[PDB]
UniProtKB/Swiss-Prot annotation, chain A:
Family the UniProt entry places it in: Belongs to the bacterial ribosomal protein bL28 family.
The keyword RNA-binding appears for this protein: yes
Assembly and binders: Part of the 50S ribosomal subunit.
NCBIfam families (alphabetical): L28
GO cellular component, one term: cytoplasm
Record PANTHER family: 39S RIBOSOMAL PROTEIN L28, MITOCHONDRIAL, LARGE RIBOSOMAL SUBUNIT PROTEIN BL28M
MF GO annotations: rRNA binding; structural constituent of ribosome
Pfam family, one: Ribosomal_L28
Protein name as it appears in the record: Large ribosomal subunit protein bL28
Biological process, per Gene Ontology: cytoplasmic translation; ribosomal large subunit assembly
Record keyword RNA-binding present: yes
Curated annotation (Swiss-Prot), chain C:
Cited InterPro entries: Ribosomal_protein_uL29, Ribosomal_uL29, Ribosomal_uL29_CS, Ribosomal_uL29_sf
Descriptive protein name: Large ribosomal subunit protein uL29
Sequence similarity: Belongs to the universal ribosomal protein uL29 family.
GO MF terms held by the record: rRNA binding; structural constituent of ribosome
Complex formation: Part of the 50s ribosomal subunit. Contacts protein L23, trigger factor and protein nascent chains. Might also contact SecE and probably does contact SecG when the SecYEG translocation complex is docked with the ribosome.
This protein's encoding gene: rpmC
Keyword set, alphabetical order: Ribonucleoprotein, Ribosomal protein, RNA-binding, rRNA-binding
Higher taxonomy: Bacteria, Pseudomonadati, Pseudomonadota, Gammaproteobacteria, Enterobacterales
Function: Binds 23S rRNA. It is not essential for growth. One of the proteins that surrounds the polypeptide exit tunnel on the outside of the subunit. Contacts trigger factor.
Curated annotation (Swiss-Prot), chain D:
A GO BP entry: cytoplasmic translation
Family named by the database record: Belongs to the universal ribosomal protein uL23 family.
Coiled coil, from the record: none
Subunit structure: Part of the 50S ribosomal subunit. Contacts protein L29 and trigger factor. Might also contact SecE and probably does contact SecG and SecY when the SecYEG translocation complex is docked with the ribosome.
Known outcome of mutating E18Q: Strongly reduces trigger factor binding
NCBIfam families with a match to the protein in the record: PRK05738.1-1, PRK05738.1-3, PRK05738.2-4
Name of the protein this chain belongs to: Large ribosomal subunit protein uL23
Record function comment: One of the early assembly proteins, it binds 23S rRNA; is essential for growth. One of the proteins that surround the polypeptide exit tunnel on the outside of the subunit. Acts as the docking site for trigger factor for Ffh binding to the ribosome (SRP54) and to nascent polypeptide chains.
Gene3D superfamilies from the UniProt entry: 3.30.70.330
InterPro entries: Nucleotide-bd_a/b_plait_sf (IPR012677), Ribosomal_uL23-like (IPR013025), Ribosomal_uL23/eL15/eS24_sf (IPR012678), Ribosomal_uL23_CS (IPR001014)
Outcome of substituting E52K: No effect on trigger factor binding
Curated annotation (Swiss-Prot), chain E:
SUPFAM superfamilies named in the record: Translation proteins SH3-like domain
One Gene Ontology term from the biological process aspect of the record: cytoplasmic translation
Protein name, UniProt field: Large ribosomal subunit protein uL24
Organism whose genome encodes this protein: Escherichia coli (strain K12)
Keyword Phosphoprotein on entry: no
Keywords, sorted A to Z: Ribonucleoprotein, Ribosomal protein, RNA-binding, rRNA-binding
Role according to the record: One of two assembly initiator proteins, it binds directly to the 5'-end of the 23S rRNA, where it nucleates assembly of the 50S subunit. It is not thought to be involved in the functions of the mature 50S subunit in vitro. One of the proteins that surrounds the polypeptide exit tunnel on the outside of the subunit.
Gene name linked to the record: rplX
Amino acid sequence: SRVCQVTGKRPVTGNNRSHALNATKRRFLPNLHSHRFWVESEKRFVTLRVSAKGMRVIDKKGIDTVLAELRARGEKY
Amino acid sequence: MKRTFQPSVLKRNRSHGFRARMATKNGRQVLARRRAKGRARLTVSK
Amino acid sequence: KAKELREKSVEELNTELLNLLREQFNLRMQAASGQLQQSHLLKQVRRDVARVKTLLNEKAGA
Amino acid sequence: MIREERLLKVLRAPHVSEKASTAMEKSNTIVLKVAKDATKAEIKAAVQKLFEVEVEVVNTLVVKGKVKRHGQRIGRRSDWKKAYVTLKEGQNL
Amino acid sequence: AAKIRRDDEVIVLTGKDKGKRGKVKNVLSSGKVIVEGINLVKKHQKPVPALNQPGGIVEKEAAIQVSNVAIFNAATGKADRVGFRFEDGKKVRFFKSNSETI
RNA sequence: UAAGGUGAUAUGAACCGUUAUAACCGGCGAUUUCCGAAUGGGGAAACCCAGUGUGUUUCGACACACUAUCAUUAACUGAAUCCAUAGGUUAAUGAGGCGAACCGGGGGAACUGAAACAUCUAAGUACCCCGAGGAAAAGAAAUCAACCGAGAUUCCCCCAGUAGCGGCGAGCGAACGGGGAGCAGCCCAGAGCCUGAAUCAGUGUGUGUGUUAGUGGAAGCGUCUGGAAAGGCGCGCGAUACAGGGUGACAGCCCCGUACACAAAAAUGCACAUGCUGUGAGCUCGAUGAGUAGGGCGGGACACGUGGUAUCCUGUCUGAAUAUGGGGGGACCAUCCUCCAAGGCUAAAUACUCCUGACUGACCGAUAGUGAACCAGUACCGUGAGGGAAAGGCGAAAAGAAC
RNA sequence: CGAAGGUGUGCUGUGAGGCAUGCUGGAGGUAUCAGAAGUGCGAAUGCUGACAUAAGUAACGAUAAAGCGGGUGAAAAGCCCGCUCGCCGGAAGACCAAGGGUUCCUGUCCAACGUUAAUCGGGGCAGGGUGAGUCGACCCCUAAGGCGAGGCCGAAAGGCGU
Ligand SMILES: [Mg+2]
Ligand SMILES: [Mg+2]
Ligand SMILES: [Mg+2]
Ligand SMILES: [Mg+2]
Ligand SMILES: [Mg+2]
Ligand SMILES: [Mg+2]
Ligand SMILES: [Mg+2]
Ligand SMILES: [Mg+2]
Ligand SMILES: [Mg+2]
Ligand SMILES: [Mg+2]
Ligand SMILES: [Mg+2]
Ligand SMILES: [Mg+2]
Ligand SMILES: [Mg+2]
Ligand SMILES: [Mg+2]
Ligand SMILES: [Mg+2]
Ligand SMILES: [Mg+2]
Ligand SMILES: [Mg+2]
Ligand SMILES: [Mg+2]
Ligand SMILES: [Mg+2]
Ligand SMILES: [Mg+2]
Ligand SMILES: [Mg+2]
Ligand SMILES: [Mg+2]
Ligand SMILES: [Mg+2]
Ligand SMILES: [Mg+2]
Ligand SMILES: [Mg+2]
Ligand SMILES: [Mg+2]
Ligand SMILES: [Mg+2]
Ligand SMILES: [Mg+2]
Ligand SMILES: [Mg+2]
Ligand SMILES: [Mg+2]
Ligand SMILES: [Mg+2]
Ligand SMILES: [Mg+2]
Ligand SMILES: [Mg+2]
Ligand SMILES: [Mg+2]
Ligand SMILES: [Mg+2]
Ligand SMILES: [Mg+2]
Ligand SMILES: [Mg+2]
Ligand SMILES: [Mg+2]
Ligand SMILES: [Mg+2]
Ligand SMILES: [Mg+2]
């Protein structure tokens, strides 16, 4: 599914509002990308389905910190 | 002339049988409704 | 019965069970040929088999 | 292959009729009601131990119980197994 | 718990046989009793070929409501009522009028 | 608990029992085919076919046990590729499926209303989906207030159809404050000192008490009519019992009850007391939740439709300060007041009824009341989802009509 | 020593109605003054049931066709036996499959069913009847297609697939 493995960001629903204020149901999808992260501690690359926001979270916290959250959640990588 | 009901037990069971109902979520809902109604026959069987 | 059968051993109860099952067979043959006047005997034999089997069960895993 | 407890429960009743009488007189065959789940091997062994006679061959069929209508509601008699137990030339019972 | 029992001498309180006495022959689960010489009927019994049995008008006791009979207190010659008490480790019946065990 | 019994149509047959293994009622056990989550594999449900391990005064074939998937944990094993990791096998433990309503969450209509219709309405309704509990959710202030003060959450009554929102149409519709039900507060973001010190859960025992069988339970007779008396008439009696039902017509005193008084071998609920395993109390010195708050863009939520619009959530792009600090007080600024976000837990008052027991009704009484008083979710119809009836009353007693 | 209800009659009220009483019925009814409403039917091509009408009318289902003798029986055009006559014969015969499910055979019965009578029946009731190593199924093998450990994908449900 279109779910960020880091933040949990998923498709949300809302409306397209026209100039005439006609509401039509829509979705806002997360900016998802499958990215290979180098994990020094495991001497292996880990491919995660992450939003650009989640990628910034990994830049701040570090991949080991983020992967530890995934283990605690039971979420495999 | 040729009428709409042309029998076949194999096609009867494959299309409406117990196992066919059990195979999908919506078919298990058919069985659940029929059980709540208190139906004697849930499906056509042997 | 039930108290009298409880005193018997596992080997003894297995013998009585075989005897009751032989009697059950002979009574069924007698009933089926229309030769059994005492219809009540079938229920007595059937419930004795039940008593023997119940006691064998409480002696095997207790 | 066998067990006495099983053999004692396998034979249910002699079946009486004109066909059963003629099968005995002409072919030395006894007609029985046997347990529904009884196999030809079980019926052979049970007749040999309990009736003390030698069995040549066992033939079996399943009889479908008749349905009777009682107004709007139906009744159904039980299906049962019939055995044609042929005994060897030397006849006893 | 039952106030009227098989073999008791009872007196009829209600019906065609009011005042008459008789022995309880059987007590039925319906709350009815058969009492000897009481509530007689003359049934037109149909013939049964399976006996080669002919038909016949048969006189028999018909069941009477148990509430329609009273325990007969022979000692007082009167209809009585039953009470219950424990004498020894056993429950007993007693006549309400004279407090005597049955 | 008992003098009667072997459920019904439903007799009859053969029997069981009467002072205590007849039956009947309740507690705990045993047995519990096959299908069904169905779980050894398969499958057109109730069937077809196996592997492995065991048994055979007969060690052929049958009987019996185990063998599904996934998750966590452990042991053995083990690639590309040296280590490693993946993978593989086995074992332990758990899950799965079903089912009323209430409950939290993910999605989410339209008819309709606007006397047309698109903003708006219907309505976060119907429905679909996920999950949970006896309740759920919420919850101990970055909350209000107004310079006086209040002190978590939930629910009820007001405030008030007010202030507002609104093609300022149709409609939508607060809060502040007041009266009430109920009330309870805690822990982590860490170390030391003293150590198992408050609490909570699992669970042995003990007592109280509740449930699942039960026990006792007052007092009326004569006469008349009548097929029959409970009715009329006469005279009695009980009542902490004249609730109600039955009995050949309407019974306080005939029967079952009712008021009142009692009872458990066994299992179980709730309390306290107490044993045990695990958890930690108190004190001192600290620490104080960052891709967060804030912002731009698009939406959504707030009674509040972008409006002069504060507050909340966030799909996208960004991005602080650090108690000499930060949030809020409905654009915004100053002053002042008030609170301390980015961690978590928590009972009550609140919502509901598939079911169990007791009781009640100016509710129905067979075209009514359930669709169904009755063998009804049946018969019947339809490929199917599904739809879905009609149908109660002899008599007090079958004495159901011998001949 | 006769309630409600039903069916008559008499009196009474402006009327909706009321009272009395004969007969039927067989156990319930309720003054008065208040109280509450599922409170009044001729219509809605109203709803359910019952019963008329047309009318003893149409029809009795292929125009292949019957006749007679004897029988059984309460009754015979129709059933049984017999002799003829006629019809089909690439079927209107025989055998499979599918589908049905006892309709099969024997005895017995005739209400209803059978477009008539019915002694007859695929109708009622009872009993009987289906016997496999080599006929079919199961079984081994695959087709289209289905399902599908892991997996890939998707708000959830799910979709696809090794
Ligand atoms: Mg053979
Ligand atoms: Mg066969
Ligand atoms: Mg008592
Ligand atoms: Mg399976
Ligand atoms: Mg299986
Ligand atoms: Mg297979
Ligand atoms: Mg290696
Ligand atoms: Mg579940
Ligand atoms: Mg409109
Ligand atoms: Mg639960
Ligand atoms: Mg909670
Ligand atoms: Mg202050
Ligand atoms: Mg409102
Ligand atoms: Mg208040
Ligand atoms: Mg208070
Ligand atoms: Mg009493
Ligand atoms: Mg009467
Ligand atoms: Mg903080
Ligand atoms: Mg904020
Ligand atoms: Mg303006
Ligand atoms: Mg201000
Ligand atoms: Mg907090
Ligand atoms: Mg209840
Ligand atoms: Mg009804
Ligand atoms: Mg009526
Ligand atoms: Mg009335
Ligand atoms: Mg009246
Ligand atoms: Mg009035
Ligand atoms: Mg009318
Ligand atoms: Mg009119
Ligand atoms: Mg005409
Ligand atoms: Mg004419
Ligand atoms: Mg004509
Ligand atoms: Mg006639
Ligand atoms: Mg038939
Ligand atoms: Mg025939
Ligand atoms: Mg006819
Ligand atoms: Mg027939
Ligand atoms: Mg899978
Ligand atoms: Mg697939």
